[PDB]
Write a protein that holds these residues in place. Structure first.
Motif, PDB file in Angstrom:
ATOM      1  N   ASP A  77       0.552   3.990 -10.883  1.00  0.00           N
ATOM      2  CA  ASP A  77       1.695   3.721 -10.024  1.00  0.00           C
ATOM      3  C   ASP A  77       2.022   4.943  -9.169  1.00  0.00           C
ATOM      4  OD1 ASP A  77       4.123   5.157 -11.097  1.00  0.00           O
ATOM      5  OD2 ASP A  77       3.596   4.031 -12.917  1.00  0.00           O
ATOM      6  N   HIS A  78       2.859   4.724  -8.150  1.00  0.00           N
ATOM      7  CA  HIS A  78       3.099   5.751  -7.150  1.00  0.00           C
ATOM      8  C   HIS A  78       3.870   6.937  -7.704  1.00  0.00           C
ATOM      9  CE1 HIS A  78       2.626   5.712  -2.514  1.00  0.00           C
ATOM     10  NE2 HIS A  78       2.246   6.869  -3.027  1.00  0.00           N
ATOM     11  N   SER A  79       4.450   6.843  -8.911  1.00  0.00           N
ATOM     12  CA  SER A  79       5.127   8.006  -9.473  1.00  0.00           C
ATOM     13  C   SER A  79       4.169   9.177  -9.555  1.00  0.00           C
ATOM     14  CB  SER A  79       5.763   7.681 -10.822  1.00  0.00           C
ATOM     15  OG  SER A  79       4.800   7.576 -11.847  1.00  0.00           O
TER      16      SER A  79
ATOM     17  N   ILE B 200       0.695  12.060   4.283  1.00  0.00           N
ATOM     18  CA  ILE B 200       0.622  10.807   5.030  1.00  0.00           C
ATOM     19  C   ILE B 200       0.620   9.677   4.010  1.00  0.00           C
ATOM     20  CG2 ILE B 200      -0.607   9.398   6.702  1.00  0.00           C
ATOM     21  CD1 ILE B 200      -1.599  11.900   8.011  1.00  0.00           C
ATOM     22  N   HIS B 201       1.687   8.894   4.037  1.00  0.00           N
ATOM     23  CA  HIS B 201       2.069   7.940   3.009  1.00  0.00           C
ATOM     24  C   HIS B 201       2.019   6.555   3.638  1.00  0.00           C
ATOM     25  CE1 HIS B 201       5.842   6.331   0.781  1.00  0.00           C
ATOM     26  NE2 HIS B 201       4.766   6.115   0.042  1.00  0.00           N
ATOM     27  N   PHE B 202       1.109   5.704   3.157  1.00  0.00           N
ATOM     28  CA  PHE B 202       1.031   4.313   3.588  1.00  0.00           C
ATOM     29  C   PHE B 202       1.766   3.471   2.550  1.00  0.00           C
ATOM     30  CE2 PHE B 202      -2.405   4.252   6.855  1.00  0.00           C
ATOM     31  CZ  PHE B 202      -2.877   5.510   6.722  1.00  0.00           C
ATOM     32  N   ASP B 203       2.820   2.763   2.965  1.00  0.00           N
ATOM     33  CA  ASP B 203       3.668   2.095   1.992  1.00  0.00           C
ATOM     34  C   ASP B 203       4.654   1.206   2.738  1.00  0.00           C
ATOM     35  OD1 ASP B 203       5.039   1.554  -0.500  1.00  0.00           O
ATOM     36  OD2 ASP B 203       4.583   3.648  -1.111  1.00  0.00           O
ATOM     37  N   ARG B 204       5.131   0.152   2.068  1.00  0.00           N
ATOM     38  CA  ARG B 204       6.336  -0.520   2.558  1.00  0.00           C
ATOM     39  C   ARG B 204       7.597   0.195   2.090  1.00  0.00           C
ATOM     40  NH1 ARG B 204       5.649  -5.515   4.300  1.00  0.00           N
ATOM     41  NH2 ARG B 204       7.143  -4.735   5.855  1.00  0.00           N
TER      42      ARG B 204
ATOM     43  N   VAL C  83       9.837   3.705   0.656  1.00  0.00           N
ATOM     44  CA  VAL C  83       9.909   5.108   1.046  1.00  0.00           C
ATOM     45  C   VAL C  83       9.596   6.048  -0.124  1.00  0.00           C
ATOM     46  CG1 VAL C  83      11.399   4.838   3.059  1.00  0.00           C
ATOM     47  CG2 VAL C  83      12.411   5.010   0.780  1.00  0.00           C
ATOM     48  N   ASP C  84       9.902   5.641  -1.353  1.00  0.00           N
ATOM     49  CA  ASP C  84       9.529   6.406  -2.548  1.00  0.00           C
ATOM     50  C   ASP C  84      10.145   7.812  -2.564  1.00  0.00           C
ATOM     51  OD1 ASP C  84       8.110   4.070  -3.041  1.00  0.00           O
ATOM     52  OD2 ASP C  84       6.156   5.028  -3.009  1.00  0.00           O
ATOM     53  N   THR C  85      11.379   7.926  -2.051  1.00  0.00           N
ATOM     54  CA  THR C  85      12.052   9.212  -1.868  1.00  0.00           C
ATOM     55  C   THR C  85      13.362   9.361  -2.626  1.00  0.00           C
ATOM     56  OG1 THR C  85      12.878   8.163   0.127  1.00  0.00           O
ATOM     57  CG2 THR C  85      11.134   9.775   0.409  1.00  0.00           C
TER      58      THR C  85
ATOM     59  N   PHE D 283      -2.015   6.373  -0.447  1.00  0.00           N
ATOM     60  CA  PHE D 283      -2.128   4.999   0.040  1.00  0.00           C
ATOM     61  C   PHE D 283      -1.660   4.040  -1.043  1.00  0.00           C
ATOM     62  CE2 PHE D 283      -4.089   2.360   3.337  1.00  0.00           C
ATOM     63  CZ  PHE D 283      -4.036   1.157   2.702  1.00  0.00           C
ATOM     64  N   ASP D 284      -0.498   3.432  -0.833  1.00  0.00           N
ATOM     65  CA  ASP D 284       0.020   2.414  -1.747  1.00  0.00           C
ATOM     66  C   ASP D 284      -0.563   1.087  -1.303  1.00  0.00           C
ATOM     67  OD1 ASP D 284       1.548   0.551  -3.218  1.00  0.00           O
ATOM     68  OD2 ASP D 284       3.377   1.746  -3.121  1.00  0.00           O
ATOM     69  N   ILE D 285      -1.316   0.438  -2.190  1.00  0.00           N
ATOM     70  CA  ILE D 285      -1.988  -0.821  -1.842  1.00  0.00           C
ATOM     71  C   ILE D 285      -1.001  -1.877  -1.363  1.00  0.00           C
ATOM     72  CG2 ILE D 285      -2.027  -1.983  -4.097  1.00  0.00           C
ATOM     73  CD1 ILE D 285      -5.029  -1.489  -1.695  1.00  0.00           C
TER      74      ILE D 285
HETATM   75 CA    CA Z   1       4.669   3.510  -3.133  1.00  0.00          CA
END
Ligand code: CA
Ligand code: CA
Ligand code: CA
Ligand code: CA
Ligand code: CA
Ligand code: CA
Ligand code: CA
Ligand code: CA
Ligand code: CA
Ligand code: CA
Lengths: 378, 378, 378, 378, 378
Positions: free
Chosen positions: E165-167, E188-192, E194-196, E282-284
């Protein structure tokens, strides 16, 4: 004594191969001889017949499709699908029961090892396709079902119904009773659920068929035998009817405690006492849920496959069976047609028990079949 | 200008209903009139025909099953299954491609809205079942396939092949070429993969059909058009053959950058330059993997459905098509027949484009069909 | 100009947190403060509210369940499930549509990034559970649906219907029209299928709702807008009705060729010309089959998700919407609730467009709502 | 007497931990010591060894992968995959049998509670990967299989074959017989299906292995024991061969009626009478279909897991076993590796019975292994 | 101009075959020559190498497993699995992400057609297995991840992380920063999403990595580029951090409206302005949900595969990339490894872009790699 396996080898020698050769010959005419590199010259170019199992158009056991249903009386057995799920109170999907059963039945050969039966050699079987069911009107669908089943039953062909939810037990039995005159039919019902209440969600659903069937004079509730009842889904409304109408019930624990032979003795005695034939109504959910995931009302703690199949051996061979339905297979909830396969096995075993006991092929129409339909049976 | 929808409403008025009425009438004769409570008296008791969609025996689009394949020349189109997965280099399962395609095709009507085509009214279609494939011997299976496809093609019926892995592209084209005399066929190949190497795992597998087909004089490699090539599964051995034999390739990015119309112009020009007919070989894996999970070699970044279908509109209507195959549908890896549905749409759209462009029904056998088989084509 | 992302960050600053704090506070009272080792003291011991997303009782978006439906007029929006699949002509299963939509909706927060909408802060939303549908009698189920939808609509709450097959489009619109007086409603219908024929399988099934709805004076067929029609499943009987009643249709190719903005302009103009409100009827099968496997009539070549969602942005914000239904989600055929998720997105986006355009919350009941039911509308 | 549980606790005290410590030590060297916050300093940074079970590269039971197969004689047991499905007559997919078995085997520890066996402490086990099978040519694949199995068998390592369809029973046994000299092997075959016919679909498929194996002098048909035969898929052609060659068969009902102990006595006596070793060939479809959905020929009414496992306890411990194959696991048809898990249990139990009975580790090569290959055995 | 296809054919001629021959030769030594009936003598008896694709032990792209991780600096690229799902806030299962990616990667060859890259010929790639993650303690798992990633990064091997997972974005970037000295990395973060945000469910979960990573001096929030943000799952708490720390965001609509080239220009400019290298995360789930069902936070209306892959072409080739992670693949929710396949394509394309742009193989360690770990970076 000889083992079952030793008897099976001897029984196989007694079976002919004329039905096999007939299919091979027709396949070569209609499918052409094989390409030159094929060594086995019984193989055609186009699959026409049983082989390959993974190929072809899937009628039940690849039996001939009988397009003209007016000719059904020429066959010993007629498979009829009833793609009806308007009686389902939880999951739908059993409108595809007939499709799943037909699909997985391609895995089978016509021959049963232990019984020494080859249906390709010993009976004529056709698949008449499906009743034109009516998803938006359960009662109209019932009327279609009764007309089709009455047509098949009165022809002298033995009807095997691929359900379809258990609500169809009323219109199928009604179709038979239209042609029973004043003769009586005992219903042997394999189920966890009694299916005897009057209405459910304002209609005659799969919890209700036997209330309405045993309202008919030809189907005495005192001859209704219910094998496997139990669990948490048996409606109290149905239990009340069973008590007041004096149906004959054994739970799963009753069956295993008393022995399968004693349970079958009970079913045979009670279903045939004052009746002329027996209708077999097999709800796939009577088998423990672990074996039948593709069903609307699964329940743990049911019959194990070998138990159900042994009960069938005793009951089919020792009663005069007028027809059978196998209901509640729901392919959308299945895994790799596991549940359709269990239903196929019930159907095929039943045909083999009818052969072993001399009930098929028939040498004449049974005395209980009346040609004129009594449309006022219900 | 009028919209496509406005034209569709007008086109529908121009279609007859005689084919519909013929099916209704036969259904009532062979399936009986409906029970008395059914108001629509076109409904029979037994499903016989299109309706209900969820019911019945599943031939392709519920077309008549033509048991006697010697009669296939009486039909405009013959659907033939090729349940062959001995050419698969990763996942098997496409031996069930024909079954999945037939099953899901029951969802369709014979009518296409946008094109104003009704196949029940405008062509005769039959389903001849499946080739008797040979799972343990790819070459024997090829020989069966060629004999069956040659038989259908020489009859004058237009052959549509339900695959089956792409290895069958060699024996299907070989079957056609046996009856092409000295005429030439251009192959229009929709695929991410070039399928042009000589052997794979020591045999002529699905990566190899066009090496062997274009070794035949009737199939020039210079007229082989390969639409969609790319990704990580294109074998270098095949790329070498494409380069040395001068095949015509566009990648997905080539297609989208140049415009679909220009890509189709390229395919039409290159496939027809010095040929007399075109063979359409559609690998379902040319569609982006997200739409076709039930396939052995899925690849992201493929064609989107509307792109592939528009290319087909241009190509089918503007070439003289001698036959088509749709390959690599693998139902065991599918979800709710999604991939079978995409293949069904390709097949049905193709038939409709043949009707719109006046290629079907045929008024005479095409000049390129020769009655005597040239068994030395390969 | 600022990007959408830059505007989104600014819009978020304008949203309050009182609704969030209210839920936190109630959660701590009713679910207890957390154990001592939990640092974030907004966390309770028992999940009560949005968090954790994977936990809890699944009402739609974890909205309050409104047990007493007589109080529904106190809420801006009422989610109502219609677990009805008696109108399905191929696959059933959409009786579980409401369950799948509720389940997967737990993944969402109440906040939309691009629009700067927080439904927890800006509207009151309740889930009233499901209509008591009647699987064995489509017409009785219709009567239940109309009574429930009429009750919600007349209360002033905005109704969002979770289907359920498209046959419910008749009883839902009928329920609205019972309370429209002489006002008129334009129907904006997203579908591949016209759904305008009179009967199917002898009943008023999912191919028939708009025949019967536009027979009502309040719903003019000339204001019925049908976006996405095409493929192989559009019944000719329905096309005839569309032509004779002059409905407004755009195919998928019409939409993509003319531009989404022009297609929306067409829908808005035609649906509002001579009407007072618009009903949104979104069939999930209008989306290309690759995105919506859990549906009864999938079709390739449909709308892509971003296309459908952009059309909704234009249409919802620029019409006076009286209610919406999202139909045909069939969880038994889905993969990991993919199709339920697409339907959830349509529902949530619609609510957000109603907020952005100032249609919710309402400051007064709309002029078109009449308190007395006209039971003779149909 | 002490219970099995009480004996298990005592047996566990008798097992060493040197193999465990060796793996821990190598893991720390090759995977680094753990980060500072990890308290258990047997944990490395990179998973290297058994733990975590959900992590790592999946060889069978995470055994070492033996890249150089020439070294296989250094190991007590060699796991070899045979990813071969060219012999399948219905569903393919068992070419992935070895992959599914390897994957799910990560759930296991090397220790069996009831038997007090720890394979990490008591034997050396390697995974040699897979035979390079030939999907398009069953006979070429057979030749690869025999060469690889002959290589492993002649080295002195005990071979365990992960199938793969049952057709491989011929080339695996042929590989053994190449190195048996004039010694004889009894085949103990667990199956519903006799697998004794000569050809199927023109080739030597999974219904044919024992016809061809018992044509070899080293494998007497009179010592072939077939446990579980029955149902509807047993081909008559195979039954004829069983009768004429006098194989030893018990049906499922024979087994349960006579008692498992008597059935095992029968198998042991018949398989060892005039032979020097026994080959175990376990078709996963001998287990009732409800437990093994991932298989090509499922059949209801089979053995229950505890019955099959008890038969193995008796048979493995009381015969001199030269090798084993577990065939017909087909992951594409499985649910959550249920069927792969059953096969893993058979394999691991067998190894444990070999340890308990003193057959592994070997102190010397068995007398029946001959170093020179007799390539004319067949 | 020449088409992409025409350039691809020319590029293929420029690739050597020494790496191929090396694998063939080793396979024949270690797997034996093939049986005599095999014609292609590059085939061994035991699969050893790429072929067959369906066979063998599944490391990523069948790369060598590097048991001794101390040797990782000898390889250009090291694949490392991070089987970690303790940061998941909805569905778990991504602890099996690395397994699904490895499994489906067996479908690929090492060669990309359009780019003319052959990784077997142009780089050395190893698979180091998995980090020993700690499911019950997210922070301990983070510590393991950072130590392993720091080890690989400092060796000079290019790290590619299979999530998980993105953690893990925090501990992976932390591992890099331990060896960056005072150099700066743009993310460079590909995602829907923000994960912030700072915490979620009281811990540093997959919604929180960039809060904690950009707290480190080496990772400036002003260089964090977030491509694809939108939908209904973007937490308001994270949006607040993005606004206050001035991250760089484009929504899906921003990207498609501005053009992919302009969006990539934005990402490149913002991520490299004042940094020395770029980390790709890159988040799928940035891909539309219809293509990636096997993920915990699917969302409709995402990037289409060709859009994401084109953005990668621009970004990877035009920045100095220090490593990459592909996260959130959750095989339990997937269909036929569709989602694992999309992630595999991202990984392989990235390697090919690094080759095309001359970033791999490296001729020397990059200036930004410092040998001594700064354990106080966070
Ligand atoms: Ca993510
Ligand atoms: Ca029942
Ligand atoms: Ca029941
Ligand atoms: Ca292909
Ligand atoms: Ca392909
Ligand atoms: Ca609709
Ligand atoms: Ca529709
Ligand atoms: Ca077998
Ligand atoms: Ca078997
Ligand atoms: Ca995400």
């Amino acid at each position: 004594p000889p083992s079952e396996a030793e008897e099976a080898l001897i029984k196989e020698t007694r079976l002919p191969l004329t039905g096999w050769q007939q299919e091979v010959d027709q396949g070569l005419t209609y499918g052409l001889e094989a390409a030159a590199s094929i060594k086995d010259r019984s193989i055609p170019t186009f699959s026409r017949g049983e082989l390959p199992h993974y190929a072809g158009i899937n009628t039940f056991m690849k039996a001939p499709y009988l397009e003209d249903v007016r000719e059904v009386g020429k066959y010993d057995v007629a498979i009829v699908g009833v793609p009806h799920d308007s009686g389902t109170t939880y999951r739908p999907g059993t409108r595809f029961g007939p499709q799943g059963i037909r699909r997985i039945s391609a895995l089978y050969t016509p021959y049963n090892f232990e019984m020494g039966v080859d249906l390709r050699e010993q009976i004529s079987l056709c698949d008449v396709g499906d009743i034109f069911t009516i998803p938006a009107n359960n009662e109209k669908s019932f009327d279609q079902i009764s007309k089709g089943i009455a047509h098949i039953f009165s022809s002298g062909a033995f009807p095997i119904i691929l359900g379809g939810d258990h609500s169809i037990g009323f219109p199928t039995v009604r179709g038979i009773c239209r042609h029973l005159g004043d003769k009586k039919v005992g219903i042997i019902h394999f189920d966890r659920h009694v299916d005897t209440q009057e209405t459910d969600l304002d209609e005659r659903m799969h919890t209700c068929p036997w209330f309405h069937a045993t309202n008919m004079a030809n189907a005495p509730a005192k001859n209704l035998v219910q094998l496997g009842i139990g669990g948490w889904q048996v409606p109290r409304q149905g239990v009340k009817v069973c008590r007041e109408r004096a149906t004959n019930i054994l739970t799963v624990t009753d069956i295993t405690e008393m022995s399968l032979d004693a349970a079958a003795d009970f079913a045979i005695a009670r279903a045939t006492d004052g009746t002329d034939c027996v209708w077999i109504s097999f709800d796939i959910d009577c088998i423990d849920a672990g074996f039948v995931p593709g069903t609307g009302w699964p329940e743990p703690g049911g019959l194990l496959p070998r138990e159900a199949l042994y009960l069938l051996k005793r009951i089919i061979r020792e009663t005069n069976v007028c027809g059978m339905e196998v209901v509640e297979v729901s392919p959308p909830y299945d895994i790799s047609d596991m549940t359709s396969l269990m239903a196929t096995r019930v159907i095929c075993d039943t045909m083999a028990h009818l052969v072993v006991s001399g009930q098929l092929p028939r040498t004449e129409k049974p005395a209980y079949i009346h040609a004129e339909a009594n449309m006022a049976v219900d």
